[PDB]
Design a protein around this ligand. Sequence first.
Ligand SMILES: *[C@@H]1O[C@H](CO)[C@@H](O[C@@H]2O[C@H](CO)[C@@H](O[C@@H]3O[C@H](CO[C@H]4O[C@H](CO)[C@@H](O)[C@H](O[C@H]5O[C@H](CO)[C@@H](O)[C@H](O)[C@@H]5O)[C@@H]4O)[C@@H](O)[C@H](O[C@H]4O[C@H](CO)[C@@H](O)[C@H](O)[C@@H]4O)[C@@H]3O)[C@H](O)[C@H]2NC(C)=O)[C@H](O)[C@H]1NC(C)=O
Ligand SMILES: *[C@@H]1O[C@H](CO)[C@@H](O[C@@H]2O[C@H](CO)[C@@H](O[C@@H]3O[C@H](CO[C@H]4O[C@H](CO)[C@@H](O)[C@H](O)[C@@H]4O)[C@@H](O)[C@H](O[C@H]4O[C@H](CO)[C@@H](O)[C@H](O)[C@@H]4O)[C@@H]3O)[C@H](O)[C@H]2NC(C)=O)[C@H](O)[C@H]1NC(C)=O
Ligand SMILES: *[C@@H]1O[C@H](CO)[C@@H](O[C@@H]2O[C@H](CO)[C@@H](O[C@@H]3O[C@H](CO)[C@@H](O)[C@H](O[C@H]4O[C@H](CO)[C@@H](O)[C@H](O)[C@@H]4O)[C@@H]3O)[C@H](O)[C@H]2NC(C)=O)[C@H](O)[C@H]1NC(C)=O
Ligand SMILES: *[C@@H]1O[C@H](CO)[C@@H](O[C@@H]2O[C@H](CO)[C@@H](O[C@@H]3O[C@H](CO)[C@@H](O)[C@H](O[C@H]4O[C@H](CO)[C@@H](O)[C@H](O)[C@@H]4O)[C@@H]3O)[C@H](O)[C@H]2NC(C)=O)[C@H](O)[C@H]1NC(C)=O
Ligand SMILES: *[C@@H]1O[C@H](CO)[C@@H](O[C@@H]2O[C@H](CO)[C@@H](O[C@@H]3O[C@H](CO)[C@@H](O)[C@H](O[C@H]4O[C@H](CO)[C@@H](O)[C@H](O)[C@@H]4O)[C@@H]3O)[C@H](O)[C@H]2NC(C)=O)[C@H](O)[C@H]1NC(C)=O
Ligand SMILES: *[C@@H]1O[C@H](CO)[C@@H](O[C@@H]2O[C@H](CO)[C@@H](O[C@@H]3O[C@H](CO)[C@@H](O)[C@H](O)[C@@H]3O)[C@H](O)[C@H]2NC(C)=O)[C@H](O)[C@H]1NC(C)=O
Ligand SMILES: *[C@@H]1O[C@H](CO)[C@@H](O[C@@H]2O[C@H](CO)[C@@H](O[C@@H]3O[C@H](CO)[C@@H](O)[C@H](O)[C@@H]3O)[C@H](O)[C@H]2NC(C)=O)[C@H](O)[C@H]1NC(C)=O
Ligand SMILES: *[C@@H]1O[C@H](CO)[C@@H](O[C@@H]2O[C@H](CO)[C@@H](O[C@@H]3O[C@H](CO)[C@@H](O)[C@H](O)[C@@H]3O)[C@H](O)[C@H]2NC(C)=O)[C@H](O)[C@H]1NC(C)=O
Ligand SMILES: *[C@@H]1O[C@H](CO)[C@@H](O[C@@H]2O[C@H](CO)[C@@H](O[C@@H]3O[C@H](CO)[C@@H](O)[C@H](O)[C@@H]3O)[C@H](O)[C@H]2NC(C)=O)[C@H](O)[C@H]1NC(C)=O
Ligand SMILES: *[C@@H]1O[C@H](CO)[C@@H](O[C@@H]2O[C@H](CO)[C@@H](O)[C@H](O)[C@H]2NC(C)=O)[C@H](O)[C@H]1NC(C)=O
Ligand SMILES: *[C@@H]1O[C@H](CO)[C@@H](O[C@@H]2O[C@H](CO)[C@@H](O)[C@H](O)[C@H]2NC(C)=O)[C@H](O)[C@H]1NC(C)=O
Ligand SMILES: *[C@@H]1O[C@H](CO)[C@@H](O[C@@H]2O[C@H](CO)[C@@H](O)[C@H](O)[C@H]2NC(C)=O)[C@H](O)[C@H]1NC(C)=O
Ligand SMILES: *[C@@H]1O[C@H](CO)[C@@H](O)[C@H](O)[C@H]1NC(C)=O
Ligand SMILES: *[C@@H]1O[C@H](CO)[C@@H](O)[C@H](O)[C@H]1NC(C)=O
Ligand SMILES: *[C@@H]1O[C@H](CO)[C@@H](O)[C@H](O)[C@H]1NC(C)=O
Ligand SMILES: *[C@@H]1O[C@H](CO)[C@@H](O)[C@H](O)[C@H]1NC(C)=O
Ligand SMILES: *[C@@H]1O[C@H](CO)[C@@H](O)[C@H](O)[C@H]1NC(C)=O
Ligand SMILES: *[C@@H]1O[C@H](CO)[C@@H](O)[C@H](O)[C@H]1NC(C)=O
Ligand SMILES: *[C@@H]1O[C@H](CO)[C@@H](O)[C@H](O)[C@H]1NC(C)=O
Ligand SMILES: *[C@@H]1O[C@H](CO)[C@@H](O)[C@H](O)[C@H]1NC(C)=O
Lengths: 134, 134, 134, 453, 48, 38, 49
Amino acid sequence: VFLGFLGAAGSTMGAASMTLTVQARNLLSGNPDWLPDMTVWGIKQLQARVLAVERYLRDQQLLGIWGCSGKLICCTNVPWNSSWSNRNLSEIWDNMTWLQWDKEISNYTQIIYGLLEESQNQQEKNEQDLLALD
Amino acid sequence: VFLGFLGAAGSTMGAASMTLTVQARNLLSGNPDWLPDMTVWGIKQLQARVLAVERYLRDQQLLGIWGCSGKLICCTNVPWNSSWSNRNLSEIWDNMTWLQWDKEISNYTQIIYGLLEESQNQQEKNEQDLLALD
Amino acid sequence: VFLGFLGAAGSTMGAASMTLTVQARNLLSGNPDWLPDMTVWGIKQLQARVLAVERYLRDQQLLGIWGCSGKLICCTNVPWNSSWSNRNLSEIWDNMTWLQWDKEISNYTQIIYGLLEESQNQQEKNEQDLLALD
Amino acid sequence: NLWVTVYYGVPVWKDAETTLFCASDAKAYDTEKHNVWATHACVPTDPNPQEIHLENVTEEFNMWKNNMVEQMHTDIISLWDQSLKPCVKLTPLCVTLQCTNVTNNITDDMRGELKNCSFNMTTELRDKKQKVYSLFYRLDVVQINNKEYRLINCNTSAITQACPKVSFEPIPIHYCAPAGFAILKCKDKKFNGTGPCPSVSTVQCTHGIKPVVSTQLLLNGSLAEEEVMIRSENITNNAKNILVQFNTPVQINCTRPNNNTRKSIRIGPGQAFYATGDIIGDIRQAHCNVSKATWNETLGKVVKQLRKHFGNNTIIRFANSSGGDLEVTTHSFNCGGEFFYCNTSGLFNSTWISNTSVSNDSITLPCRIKQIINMWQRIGQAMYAPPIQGVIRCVSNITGLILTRDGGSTNSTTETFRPGGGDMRDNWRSELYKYKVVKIEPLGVAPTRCKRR
Amino acid sequence: NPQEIHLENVTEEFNMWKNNMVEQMHTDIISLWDQSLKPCVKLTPLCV
Amino acid sequence: NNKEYRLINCNTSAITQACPKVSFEPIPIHYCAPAGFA
Amino acid sequence: TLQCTNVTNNITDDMRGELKNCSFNMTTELRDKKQKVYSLFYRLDVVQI
Ligand SMILES: *[C@@H]1O[C@H](CO)[C@@H](O[C@@H]2O[C@H](CO)[C@@H](O[C@@H]3O[C@H](CO[C@H]4O[C@H](CO)[C@@H](O)[C@H](O[C@H]5O[C@H](CO)[C@@H](O)[C@H](O)[C@@H]5O)[C@@H]4O)[C@@H](O)[C@H](O[C@H]4O[C@H](CO)[C@@H](O)[C@H](O)[C@@H]4O)[C@@H]3O)[C@H](O)[C@H]2NC(C)=O)[C@H](O)[C@H]1NC(C)=O
Ligand SMILES: *[C@@H]1O[C@H](CO)[C@@H](O[C@@H]2O[C@H](CO)[C@@H](O[C@@H]3O[C@H](CO[C@H]4O[C@H](CO)[C@@H](O)[C@H](O)[C@@H]4O)[C@@H](O)[C@H](O[C@H]4O[C@H](CO)[C@@H](O)[C@H](O)[C@@H]4O)[C@@H]3O)[C@H](O)[C@H]2NC(C)=O)[C@H](O)[C@H]1NC(C)=O
Ligand SMILES: *[C@@H]1O[C@H](CO)[C@@H](O[C@@H]2O[C@H](CO)[C@@H](O[C@@H]3O[C@H](CO)[C@@H](O)[C@H](O[C@H]4O[C@H](CO)[C@@H](O)[C@H](O)[C@@H]4O)[C@@H]3O)[C@H](O)[C@H]2NC(C)=O)[C@H](O)[C@H]1NC(C)=O
Ligand SMILES: *[C@@H]1O[C@H](CO)[C@@H](O[C@@H]2O[C@H](CO)[C@@H](O[C@@H]3O[C@H](CO)[C@@H](O)[C@H](O[C@H]4O[C@H](CO)[C@@H](O)[C@H](O)[C@@H]4O)[C@@H]3O)[C@H](O)[C@H]2NC(C)=O)[C@H](O)[C@H]1NC(C)=O
Ligand SMILES: *[C@@H]1O[C@H](CO)[C@@H](O[C@@H]2O[C@H](CO)[C@@H](O[C@@H]3O[C@H](CO)[C@@H](O)[C@H](O[C@H]4O[C@H](CO)[C@@H](O)[C@H](O)[C@@H]4O)[C@@H]3O)[C@H](O)[C@H]2NC(C)=O)[C@H](O)[C@H]1NC(C)=O
Ligand SMILES: *[C@@H]1O[C@H](CO)[C@@H](O[C@@H]2O[C@H](CO)[C@@H](O[C@@H]3O[C@H](CO)[C@@H](O)[C@H](O)[C@@H]3O)[C@H](O)[C@H]2NC(C)=O)[C@H](O)[C@H]1NC(C)=O
Ligand SMILES: *[C@@H]1O[C@H](CO)[C@@H](O[C@@H]2O[C@H](CO)[C@@H](O[C@@H]3O[C@H](CO)[C@@H](O)[C@H](O)[C@@H]3O)[C@H](O)[C@H]2NC(C)=O)[C@H](O)[C@H]1NC(C)=O
Ligand SMILES: *[C@@H]1O[C@H](CO)[C@@H](O[C@@H]2O[C@H](CO)[C@@H](O[C@@H]3O[C@H](CO)[C@@H](O)[C@H](O)[C@@H]3O)[C@H](O)[C@H]2NC(C)=O)[C@H](O)[C@H]1NC(C)=O
Ligand SMILES: *[C@@H]1O[C@H](CO)[C@@H](O[C@@H]2O[C@H](CO)[C@@H](O[C@@H]3O[C@H](CO)[C@@H](O)[C@H](O)[C@@H]3O)[C@H](O)[C@H]2NC(C)=O)[C@H](O)[C@H]1NC(C)=O
Ligand SMILES: *[C@@H]1O[C@H](CO)[C@@H](O[C@@H]2O[C@H](CO)[C@@H](O)[C@H](O)[C@H]2NC(C)=O)[C@H](O)[C@H]1NC(C)=O
Ligand SMILES: *[C@@H]1O[C@H](CO)[C@@H](O[C@@H]2O[C@H](CO)[C@@H](O)[C@H](O)[C@H]2NC(C)=O)[C@H](O)[C@H]1NC(C)=O
Ligand SMILES: *[C@@H]1O[C@H](CO)[C@@H](O[C@@H]2O[C@H](CO)[C@@H](O)[C@H](O)[C@H]2NC(C)=O)[C@H](O)[C@H]1NC(C)=O
Ligand SMILES: *[C@@H]1O[C@H](CO)[C@@H](O)[C@H](O)[C@H]1NC(C)=O
Ligand SMILES: *[C@@H]1O[C@H](CO)[C@@H](O)[C@H](O)[C@H]1NC(C)=O
Ligand SMILES: *[C@@H]1O[C@H](CO)[C@@H](O)[C@H](O)[C@H]1NC(C)=O
Ligand SMILES: *[C@@H]1O[C@H](CO)[C@@H](O)[C@H](O)[C@H]1NC(C)=O
Ligand SMILES: *[C@@H]1O[C@H](CO)[C@@H](O)[C@H](O)[C@H]1NC(C)=O
Ligand SMILES: *[C@@H]1O[C@H](CO)[C@@H](O)[C@H](O)[C@H]1NC(C)=O
Ligand SMILES: *[C@@H]1O[C@H](CO)[C@@H](O)[C@H](O)[C@H]1NC(C)=O
Ligand SMILES: *[C@@H]1O[C@H](CO)[C@@H](O)[C@H](O)[C@H]1NC(C)=O
């Protein structure tokens, strides 16, 4: 079910996974037209919509250095750790929200980005170069 | 044949398909250097070249939410509808321009974007997650 | 070995190839916060960080028109020319820096970009369209 | 068995503060007043306001730590200065003014204070100078010692005249969220201001807000939902103000009865100063009418909402203001161009029994008028209000109050709620209490079973 | 080198009287006058 | 009403002198299209 | 125009003393009247005409 923009903010992570392209399509282009030339009030909103794409491309950069690169669901080769969220499957995706998930991972989330940028493409790419000549 | 930028605007869609990378390379970087610090005349042209990448990334976002993501020719899994352009093959690609094509689709084009953003990656991704565990 | 940002500027190209994601992660987001509203000194630094993403997306465009598109190591189908760097393997990757490499290619580098944007995706894509119907 | 998987586009937000937009409201081209408040730069409103309710969502709001109020406060101030920047300056008006009381002091028990001032003003040319007259009005020096006068506006700051082409009629301005961010809108009828909102929706552009500069009485504001709200940053602490929102709008009618006229005397090569001409017709003081039955009912409805914090079956009082600044002690606002400074002492004489209080079709309020305002927090400038040619009458809804509690050991005795104000940010919290700005963080990680290569 | 590329087989409908390029150069020349005369010498005491 | 005179420029608007260092000789100015347009 | 005066202490004019007790008609708060003030001082100045 759609329910529009951010409609599944309190639903399950499996049901909210069914609304990924809706939250994405409305974050980048909230296009305001600035054809009128008004001096000092443009530099505040233009700085805002320039920092918007600076924050956007920072996520695309993190979504580029990882083996994941399609702007969709994507799988990696880094194993899940039992210390992170000591829970089984379907306890998460059918009784948890993305907010409460990010809250429990916020303690351990900072190292996961490093485990996705070094443990893979510093070695996966190196293995791809050392396994394609044959 | 090349014929430079926009050289195949009146040619066939098959011949113009042979000049995709030429129209792309000259739309993003028309780089003007703004090292001189002139007060009020920069905010108009800088707003122009900021809205340029805002319009550019809007297309990349639409070219990201779809199964298509390579900045090239790309195929999907949505079938063509006989109500859209009641014409056979080679009647299009050898006697039609991209302008006249966009004109006839302009009546039916708005739903095709929805058929490419929901009928696929809301389901293709979901099927990819439910068909990769084996 | 890491050695941080630009740590392998004088190392071998094979050892520096082990630090690609480090040089990439720190070039795009050097995020300065511009919440304070100061009139004339913002337009100089904001123009700088707008030309930063204009130069960034120009590389992504060149990294998009080529068969290479993953922001990683990537291989093509254009053969190496003996006129470019008359050297064997392991003479480069174990006794040369990326700076000295770009210096020797600077004489012949301008045509390589053309050989990667036309000799491939003007023909590789066309062959992909003419070899997928079966 | 299970591996980490990234998900791009998850509904995850973190509260932050960033620059917001502003809306044109779309009738701006048909206004053609050359410049309204923010018609200058704001962009038109979307055809359909994307108001999406988020089910199962409880979000913690806090209107008193909000950064949207600081933005609208800094937008209004920068709106004042940029509006008065290209207009006519009146620094040569700081001269000596030999003035005279108005010719009609009839029954000096009643008051009459307009000063038929004449002075040597500079002219079109620089060689000669001409003598003009008729600045008028109560705000003035007493002189140093026909009696001499000068401007005490000149005793503080420089003076510039407001452009006569622009207007002060508030255009509905609703702030808008930029790309990548969102605005969360509380929706339950009763809301403390501080606490979790169980019914939250999201929008980009907010609902239409009229920038109204008013003290002691909130005007043309948004009505509450079903019950009168008593909001405060800290109810126990006395110094913190008590914002009130009304359920039923209190009708108020203000009039400047003096059928007035203007004079365009020429000063300098391009400038032109507008002076208050001789009053045509009879004269009497400006006033504001509030129906006594509606105000009696509104007080009888607010007193019950106030007893919930201060005691069931107890008495509360509220007298008039204490004293101090004229903009603080008086219900100051604008209408048509003139700036009414009415005294609300005729409204706040009340003590309350647990069932009643301790005809007269209406309650009238005396009101003085002022044209030179030092309301600007930059004390380097002051604005001269141009005279309005004709009679002025404007109606309005009263939706709010700003009250201060008398401190001390008044527990066993009664409490007193004198009116107050001063800080402009309190005028905005009655409209931005239900709004919070959040930034979107769509990068999420979650374990599923899948394998690459 | 001015990149002047002719587009064969192309007929484009032009209208010089509804053009917005004229409005831009009109608003550029006026803003050019004011910014050029802004820091110069004022002669208001010459009105004698 | 040697006869007196004044400026009728002063009868309309303020006056400012043109900078003597700048010139009014027109430099060839051709407009240019930004990125993404033609 | 500033009618000035050497400082009152030139003691031993072999050593130098150069601060000018200047007084002048400055404009005031109002535009009608003008007041006379003093004490600009210091070596940087004209010699007059
Ligand atoms: C602030 O709070 C104060 C106090 O709460 C409010 O001020 C008060 O306002 C009222 C209304 O104006 C003032 O009331 C006075 O009313 C009398 C008229 O009533 C008297 O005389 C009647 C006949 O003339 C008589 O019938 C009345 O009742 C008697 O007789 C009946 C018969 O059955 C009997 O049953 C009763 O027991 C009585 O015996 C009653 O005696 C009126 O004359 C007053 O005005 C005149 O006099 C005053 C002072 O003398 C003078 O100031 C006026 O100018 C005028 O000359 C007056 O209207 C009451 O006096 C006010 N209180 C004070 C302290 O002044 C106030 O409204 C609130 N707001 C503000 C803005 O201040
Ligand atoms: C709170 O909200 C109320 C709305 O109820 C506001 O009250 C309105 O205030 C405005 C501005 O002062 C008033 O509009 C003015 O009306 C004057 C009288 O016009 C009469 O004739 C016209 C034409 O038929 C009628 O539409 C109108 O109702 C009257 O019968 C005008 O002279 C004023 O002119 C102004 O705008 C014109 C536009 O061209 C300019 O040329 C003028 O120079 C000038 O700027 C103006 O239109 C209005 O009458 C009030 N009443 C309403 C709508 O009920 C409050 O001001 C507002 N704020 C506060 C703090 O209370
Ligand atoms: C506020 O004060 C001002 C003064 O600063 C005052 O304006 C003056 O009003 C008087 C009213 O009598 C004007 O005096 C007359 O005005 C008429 C025009 O209406 C003239 O025609 C008169 O001159 C005739 O009579 C004179 C008598 O000797 C003759 O000498 C002359 O030749 C004419 O025949 C006379 O001037 C006065 O002119 C104005 N002042 C100005 C500058 O216009 C104003 O009325 C006061 N307002 C209030 C409400 O008190
Ligand atoms: C709240 O309400 C109270 C009353 O409950 C109110 O207090 C009153 O204020 C008025 C002024 O608004 C006072 O009246 C003055 O009293 C002084 C002496 O105390 C007189 O000198 C004053 O007259 C002078 O000015 C007149 C102007 O023309 C001259 O004609 C005259 O010759 C004098 O120079 C004036 O009468 C009044 O005394 C008080 N007190 C009471 C209880 O009435 C208070 O102002 C209200 N507001 C606030 C902010 O508290
Ligand atoms: C630089 O020059 C300035 C002048 O521009 C000078 O300032 C003046 O100093 C003198 C010092 O005597 C002041 O003169 C006296 O000042 C006292 C106050 O301290 C007054 O009380 C005096 O007046 C009384 O005596 C008079 C004598 O007749 C009486 O007439 C009068 O009624 C009083 O009883 C007298 O004015 C003088 O006032 C100042 N000038 C000003 C404008 O204040 C300054 O000192 C010089 N500095 C140096 C270092 O040379
Ligand atoms: C506006 O300007 C007029 C004229 O410029 C001012 O009139 C001036 O008034 C003063 C005060 O009375 C006069 O001073 C007196 O002069 C006489 C000699 O003329 C002298 O004996 C007295 O002791 C006193 O100093 C002054 O002369 C007079 N100017 C003229 C030209 O007559 C007027 O005061 C100014 N202000 C206003 C508010 O009108
Ligand atoms: C120059 O401006 C200042 C203000 O910036 C003037 O100060 C004024 O001083 C008077 C003194 O009486 C203040 O009056 C106040 O009255 C209330 C009662 O109404 C009393 O409780 C206070 O204690 C005080 O006496 C007045 O508010 C204050 N401000 C203004 C705007 O008048 C100063 O007088 C000005 N200079 C001259 C020469 O007038
Ligand atoms: C505002 O509301 C209050 C509360 O309803 C009104 O108070 C009421 O006032 C009337 C007349 O002033 C009172 O009636 C009189 O009461 C006296 C008490 O001694 C009695 O002797 C008279 O014969 C007469 O009955 C009434 O009791 C009082 N209370 C209530 C509950 O009605 C007040 O009048 C209102 N103000 C208005 C309408 O302007
Ligand atoms: C500051 O202002 C005062 C007064 O505005 C100036 O005083 C003026 O000084 C001059 C030069 O001595 C006086 O001129 C003389 O006037 C007499 C007649 O009064 C005449 O016979 C002489 O031939 C000479 O022209 C002038 O009258 C006097 N002004 C007044 C009102 O007395 C003063 O010079 C100004 N400058 C300074 C630095 O103080
Ligand atoms: C204007 O106000 C003044 C007072 O400021 C009034 O002047 C006094 O009026 C009384 C009448 O009872 C006379 O007895 C006094 O002699 C007047 N004072 C002076 C100085 O003359 C005056 O009545 C008021 N009205 C008018 C029309 O001037
Ligand atoms: C404020 O003014 C309005 C309009 O002038 C008043 O509304 C009128 O009230 C009278 C008396 O009840 C009615 O007969 C009219 O039909 C009303 N007109 C409208 C348009 O509603 C209002 O009563 C005034 N309020 C006060 C407190 O004076
Ligand atoms: C201030 O400087 C002046 C010179 O510019 C000194 O004036 C002279 O002092 C000598 C003392 O030897 C006298 O003989 C002269 O007559 C003075 N000149 C004049 C013109 O009078 C003066 O002494 C210095 N100091 C003071 C206190 O004024
Ligand atoms: C899990 O995390 C802990 C502490 O971060 C680490 O010691 C352990 O090796 C990790 N295990 C796996 C399987 O990643
Ligand atoms: C074609 O479009 C029509 C109307 O939009 C729709 O009813 C029909 O199902 C479509 N058919 C296919 C094959 O998409
Ligand atoms: C190498 O480059 C030369 C000159 O650029 C060219 O003539 C030759 O064909 C190239 N050979 C290959 C194999 O690319
Ligand atoms: C007249 O003006 C004087 C100015 O000193 C003022 O004090 C007095 O109250 C006024 N008289 C009136 C208005 O009756
Ligand atoms: C309000 O102020 C009182 C007195 O300082 C203090 O005891 C109380 O904790 C405060 N409450 C809040 C919410 O700030
Ligand atoms: C106190 O509470 C009771 C019951 O909740 C309520 O009926 C009463 O109205 C309250 N106090 C007053 C005097 O309003
Ligand atoms: C209010 O009225 C109720 C019901 O008549 C009564 O029980 C109560 O005592 C009254 N309270 C007061 C203060 O008169
Ligand atoms: C006052 O509120 C009433 C109730 O909806 C409304 O009809 C009226 O238009 C409002 N007036 C103003 C000025 O907002």
